Design an enzyme around this catalytic site. Structure first.
Site, PDB file in Angstrom:
ATOM      1  N   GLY A   9       0.945  -1.171  -0.068  1.00  0.00           N
ATOM      2  CA  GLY A   9       0.080   0.169  -0.070  1.00  0.00           C
ATOM      3  C   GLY A   9       0.819   1.459  -0.010  1.00  0.00           C
ATOM      4  N   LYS A  11       3.642   3.987  -1.398  1.00  0.00           N
ATOM      5  CA  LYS A  11       4.211   4.504  -2.783  1.00  0.00           C
ATOM      6  C   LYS A  11       5.667   4.758  -2.748  1.00  0.00           C
ATOM      7  CE  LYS A  11      -0.277   6.443  -3.572  1.00  0.00           C
ATOM      8  NZ  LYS A  11      -1.079   7.158  -2.572  1.00  0.00           N
ATOM      9  N   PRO A  13       9.002   5.979  -4.652  1.00  0.00           N
ATOM     10  CA  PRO A  13       9.472   7.108  -5.934  1.00  0.00           C
ATOM     11  C   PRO A  13      10.344   6.313  -6.939  1.00  0.00           C
ATOM     12  CG  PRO A  13       9.880   8.312  -3.788  1.00  0.00           C
ATOM     13  CD  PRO A  13       9.640   6.719  -3.345  1.00  0.00           C
ATOM     14  N   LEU A  15      12.473   7.470  -8.923  1.00  0.00           N
ATOM     15  CA  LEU A  15      13.711   7.910  -8.955  1.00  0.00           C
ATOM     16  C   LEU A  15      14.338   7.949  -7.801  1.00  0.00           C
ATOM     17  CD1 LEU A  15      15.942   8.737 -11.006  1.00  0.00           C
ATOM     18  CD2 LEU A  15      14.828  10.860 -11.424  1.00  0.00           C
ATOM     19  N   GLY A  16      15.526   7.345  -7.662  1.00  0.00           N
ATOM     20  CA  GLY A  16      16.265   7.759  -6.448  1.00  0.00           C
ATOM     21  C   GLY A  16      17.718   7.708  -6.577  1.00  0.00           C
ATOM     22  N   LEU A  17      18.312   8.064  -5.381  1.00  0.00           N
ATOM     23  CA  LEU A  17      19.865   8.587  -5.456  1.00  0.00           C
ATOM     24  C   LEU A  17      20.644   7.148  -4.957  1.00  0.00           C
ATOM     25  CD1 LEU A  17      22.172  10.421  -5.803  1.00  0.00           C
ATOM     26  CD2 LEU A  17      21.963  10.691  -3.280  1.00  0.00           C
ATOM     27  N   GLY A  18      21.546   6.577  -5.755  1.00  0.00           N
ATOM     28  CA  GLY A  18      22.275   5.428  -5.308  1.00  0.00           C
ATOM     29  C   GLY A  18      23.499   5.985  -4.438  1.00  0.00           C
ATOM     30  N   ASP A  43      18.822   5.085  -1.997  1.00  0.00           N
ATOM     31  CA  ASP A  43      19.332   3.679  -2.075  1.00  0.00           C
ATOM     32  C   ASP A  43      20.677   3.256  -1.105  1.00  0.00           C
ATOM     33  OD1 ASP A  43      18.750   0.880  -2.668  1.00  0.00           O
ATOM     34  OD2 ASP A  43      21.153   1.135  -3.676  1.00  0.00           O
ATOM     35  N   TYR A  48      28.136  -0.488   2.051  1.00  0.00           N
ATOM     36  CA  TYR A  48      28.508   0.691   1.357  1.00  0.00           C
ATOM     37  C   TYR A  48      29.323   1.701   2.337  1.00  0.00           C
ATOM     38  CZ  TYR A  48      24.992  -0.618  -2.134  1.00  0.00           C
ATOM     39  OH  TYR A  48      24.242  -1.197  -3.019  1.00  0.00           O
ATOM     40  N   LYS A  77      20.026  -2.576   2.823  1.00  0.00           N
ATOM     41  CA  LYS A  77      19.872  -3.819   2.389  1.00  0.00           C
ATOM     42  C   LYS A  77      20.794  -4.699   3.633  1.00  0.00           C
ATOM     43  CE  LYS A  77      20.547  -2.358  -2.240  1.00  0.00           C
ATOM     44  NZ  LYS A  77      21.411  -1.057  -1.845  1.00  0.00           N
ATOM     45  N   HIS A 110      20.378  -8.321   0.177  1.00  0.00           N
ATOM     46  CA  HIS A 110      21.265  -7.843  -0.718  1.00  0.00           C
ATOM     47  C   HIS A 110      21.574  -8.599  -1.938  1.00  0.00           C
ATOM     48  CE1 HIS A 110      24.448  -4.417  -0.934  1.00  0.00           C
ATOM     49  NE2 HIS A 110      24.144  -4.707  -2.294  1.00  0.00           N
TER      50      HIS A 110
END
Ligand SMILES: NC(=O)c1ccc[n+]([C@@H]2O[C@H](COP(=O)([O-])OP(=O)(O)OC[C@H]3O[C@@H](n4cnc5c(N)ncnc54)[C@H](OP(=O)(O)O)[C@@H]3O)[C@@H](O)[C@H]2O)c1
Ligand SMILES: O=C(O)CCc1ccc(-c2cccc([N+](=O)[O-])c2)s1
Length: 315
Positions: A9, A11, A13, A15-18, A43, A48, A77, A110
């Site tokens: 349920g 939403k 986006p 477009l995201g930023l890596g 993300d 990382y 992740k 991941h």
């Protein structure tokens, strides 16, 4: 439309930023700028090694009254060394602590491959093979489910799962939550037609990673194909008076995918978001799909004998 409906349920986006390979010395500024110019999806991943500095950026823009928590869509992740049921909650809570958050919008397994638990992210034996753990996809999934039922995460999903691995979860006895998302590599050289069809036909949203071909990937070789430098793609870009990166980000959006381009360069972060004011033609889409060569940025030779290595299957 800027967001896609998930099976929980919420939403997401599109477009995201890596943030893979965004250095901690640079990622705080990146995220700040991203949020200023309109990004609402980030993300992340524990592996990382920059979630603290991502969290600094978020906390600050919350403090500046630029965005509300509810407006943000934060993804992280579970790393491979934490697949044991007993380790999953602590892994998630470390991510939440580093990001300074009290929930994640989406938490992904991941990779389907569990690795030997320990401090090392990629434990290898003396001969270079990854050391697996005696974990399986279904028990790890069950542990992810518990994160939802405890309120730590709003949605769970997977990454780098082949269609048979996705099917395993779907067919799991006593399944509590279906995966909301499968995040996979996807670009004109790796178009993923069969796995996207499969996932979309099961109501699983697909997120495309390395959409620019990850030119900064640490194992790049000069001989490798280069999407951003591809003259064919440049020519489609010049036709639309857009950059090659913008065409490469628009392309998955028109396939009903989520896409997460990475940059730490403020100019490019802003450039990459300006993809909602043009449309690739039917011919452009057909042209770009035609460039598939089944070429992967992310496939480690060191994991190819793991029982759960995902890329022996056709899809
Ligand atoms: N699930 C997983 O297994 C997995 C695997 C890989 C990636 N991912 C996620 O997907 C994100 C995106 O993939 P990626 O990081 O592999 O690579 P990418 O987004 O395909 O490419 C990033 C590279 O492109 C450069 N770049 C960005 N915008 C550009 C522009 N407008 N013009 C020219 N160059 C530009 C960046 O440089 P600068 O940053 O120096 O500007 C960086 O070197 C990752 O950061 C991560 O969040 C997930
Ligand atoms: O971490 C990221 O998101 C980008 C960095 C990576 C690139 C390849 C990775 C990997 C990890 C485990 C298994 C396998 N496998 O089976 O091929 C690959 S991680």
């Amino acid at each position: 439309a800027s967001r896609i409906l998930l099976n929980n349920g919420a939403k997401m986006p599109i477009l995201g930023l890596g943030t893979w390979k965004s250095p901690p010395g640079q990622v705080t500024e990146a995220v700040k700028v991203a949020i200023d110019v309109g990004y609402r999806h980030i993300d992340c991943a524990h592996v990382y090694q920059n979630e603290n500095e991502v969290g600094v950026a978020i906390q600050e823009k919350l403090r500046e009254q630029v965005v509300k928590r509810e407006e943000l869509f934060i993804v992280s992740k579970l790393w491979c060394t934490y697949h044991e049921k007993g380790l999953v909650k602590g892994a998630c809570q470390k991510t939440l602590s580093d990001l300074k958050l009290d929930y994640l919008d989406l938490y992904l397994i991941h990779w389907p491959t569990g690795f030997k638990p320990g401090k090392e992210f990629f434990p290898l034996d003396e001969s270079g093979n990854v050391v697996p753990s005696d974990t399986n996809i279904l028990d790890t999934w069950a542990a992810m489910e518990e994160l939802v039922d405890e309120g730590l995460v709003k949605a769970i999903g997977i990454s780098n799962f082949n269609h048979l691995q996705v099917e395993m979860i779907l067919n799991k006895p006593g399944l509590k939550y279906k995966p909301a998302v499968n995040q996979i590599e996807c670009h004109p050289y790796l178009t993923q037609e069969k796995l996207i069809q499969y996932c979309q036909s099961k109501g699983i949203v697909v997120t495309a990673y390395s959409p620019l071909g990850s030119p900064d990937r640490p194992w790049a070789k000069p001989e490798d194909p280069s999407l951003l430098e591809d003259p064919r793609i440049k020519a489609i870009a010049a036709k639309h008076n857009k950059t090659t990166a913008q065409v490469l980000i628009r392309f998955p959006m028109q396939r009903n995918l989520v896409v997460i381009p990475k940059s730490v360069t403020p100019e490019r972060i802003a450039e990459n978001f300006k993809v909602f004011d043009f449309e690739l033609s039917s011919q452009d889409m057909t042209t770009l799909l035609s460039y598939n060569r089944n070429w992967r940025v992310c496939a480690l030779l060191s994991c190819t004998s793991h029982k759960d290595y995902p890329f022996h299957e056709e899809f």
